[PDB]
């Protein structure tokens, strides 16, 4: 780091300027560190397992740009593919071959998708998917789950006789909010009751098949199968939001891992290799409702752009190498076990969850299966642990409500260094 | 081209595969060529004034990837900036200095913006801006104009006692559609009447200050001033959608060119240098309603990403060079005059419009000021002209309802070659 005497002078100067120019000094709320306290650091560059801030501090990174960097940051094969594409021009406004190869790859790896449509973010993917579900079924109501996050389309900015939704943000019309119904994740009986009451009127049910936006909460055995059965029984479309789980929980996503066939899936993150890229897909007959094949309108001027296709295709090639996910799932297990041991040694109660290359650390003695258990955790203790880990050179997600991520750049020495850091940081946070 | 005996064999093979994998074979509807007939070509690369298709055919390009390429395709300064950024990693998930520099640049060049927020598309920018207008005013109704296009947020997918909106797409809830009111562009009296009837309930009025999505239709003298006066009188926010006009009509946008101060502006296209990038901005007090500074929620995982910031900043530097827009405005005038002369020589009635580096060609004898005049044009004659121009090696927007674009790569010989092409193509299309 620039100072020898965790100096954050350069980040502080940038953040002070940013606060005058961007709401909260950031372009996405979580970046402002308001959940953990303090000020964020500004990043100079990222490479392998590491972030390097503008003050010269290096952090082992378990955020991975929020999921895309499953092969680590700045992977040379992804960088080479991107550099090659840049020489052809950054955007065309017309089709390119990379869009066909991308569609071939997603549909082959996630066969519930016979057809896909690229967009520019997870927000665009999910707002398109629910419009497709409404337009294909002729119904208005959408079911989502408390603790899941799908982006900021207005129909998602809603909370719970008929349990009509109410907005969670100003600027979201009340009438529209009534059409979004919210269930508790992992609650079999609540899902059954809602479909018994109004299943005929539900266009679609959207879920993170493994929750990542209330920390990492895996589904109970049979739970996703239960939701699939309710949707099929009642004529609603099952929408898996695999923006985070896709290509990360398993090569074929959470739907492969748990053996579910959704009607629609949304994708993002890994499929863009680090660049802005979303997608939605499903059976051909359903997807042919989308313009210009059918009447349901959705468009995007920069969608399918060639640099993003090249970056995502390079990452998708890497994740298809034999044993990729088994390796990362073991590394994730190793990290979680080491965190539990480090916390036990310090006398701090924690538990962990994990599915493939995503994990959750929880400040509790309970095995977390529900949003209520995630929120009953010792949030101030997490906040102290986060800052103590930063001081040890490890960047965890700055929130008790965000899953963490392993990458193939987290080699044995990186994992061990993370555990050495946790051994001290749990004692700091006790 | 690969064949010596406009072969499109390679595009045809790609398009046939794409039709099985993407709705309509495309990731954005206009790309399917359904308005003009025939099949689109697939692009191999883009450079300067030219697109090169996968069959080896070169086209002088007046689409410019729909607006971003105001300095031409593959500009070496933009490419250098992007390559430098790629070496630092493609995405961080945390703030970078480029986001601060981008905000400084937009707010300096477009001073109605004291604060901005980056997003990933024009669709995200405008759906955020209308949520901000609703949340800041406590009102529900949004006014838009027939022929303007803002992206596919559900509140925009609407058509016209109280003139309650109705959806234009399945999947868009009827209740929500009633909150969007539609006026005719350039109609002073209709705007006055709507505010007299329900101005107290209008949160925001959004407009392309120069229409580009019904071909290029400039505002009548005083029209934008009239809308500004109505909004201020009634407490509604004036939202300029400058996704297309920003940095293109003038350095300071259409709002500088016509001397208007909107309450909110949306940006895109040029500000990303070819990469997926949108923004919205306005006065600080208003923008501080946006999370995490205020309660109005909007987020984006990949927003402000460093490669996109570097590409956009490189383009914004180029467009600040002395005389940039005056030069392109003259080139645009020269092209339009040459098109009029080529058409007159062929006995075909056309007129043109232009503002800065955007223009419209119309198959009519009328000076187009209204959507009704744009739609009264000879659309089949345009379609014949489009295909004849393709055959002459010129790619115009494949729609009678899209503005065209000049770039600094359209040198004198490029413009002259375009006119030589038009001299034959107007005769083909007569
Ligand atoms: C599962 C999931 N879906 C959707 C989103 C929204 O995606 P974006 O921020 O790219 O709009 C996120 C996180 O932001 C997510 O984790
Ligand atoms: C003025 C304007 N605003 C918004 C949009 C939508 O932007 P995007 O396709 O990036 O979502 C477009 C065109 O698509 C546009 O021309």
Curated annotation (Swiss-Prot), chains A, B:
Keywords: Cytoplasm, Isomerase, Porphyrin biosynthesis, Pyridoxal phosphate. One of its GO terms (biological process) is protoporphyrinogen IX biosynthetic process. It is an enzyme of class 5 (isomerase). Transmembrane segments: none annotated. One of its GO terms (cellular component) is cytoplasm. PROSITE patterns: AA_TRANSFER_CLASS_3. Its cofactor is pyridoxal 5'-phosphate. The modification N6-(pyridoxal phosphate)lysine is found at residue 269. HAMAP family: HemL_aminotrans_3. Homodimer. Belongs to the class-III pyridoxal-phosphate-dependent aminotransferase family. HemL subfamily. GO terms for molecular function: glutamate-1-semialdehyde 2,1-aminomutase activity; pyridoxal phosphate binding; transaminase activity. This is Glutamate-1-semialdehyde 2,1-aminomutase. Pathway: Porphyrin-containing compound metabolism; protoporphyrin-IX biosynthesis; 5-aminolevulinate from L-glutamyl-tRNA(Glu): step 2/2. InterPro entries: 4pyrrol_synth_GluAld_NH2Trfase (IPR004639), Aminotrans_3 (IPR005814), Aminotrans_3_PPA_site (IPR049704), PyrdxlP-dep_Trfase (IPR015424), PyrdxlP-dep_Trfase_major (IPR015421), PyrdxlP-dep_Trfase_small (IPR015422). The keyword Isomerase applies. NCBIfam families: hemL, PRK00062.1. It is found in: Cytoplasm. It catalyses: (S)-4-amino-5-oxopentanoate = 5-aminolevulinate. Its EC number is 5.4.3.8. It comes from Stenotrophomonas maltophilia (strain K279a).
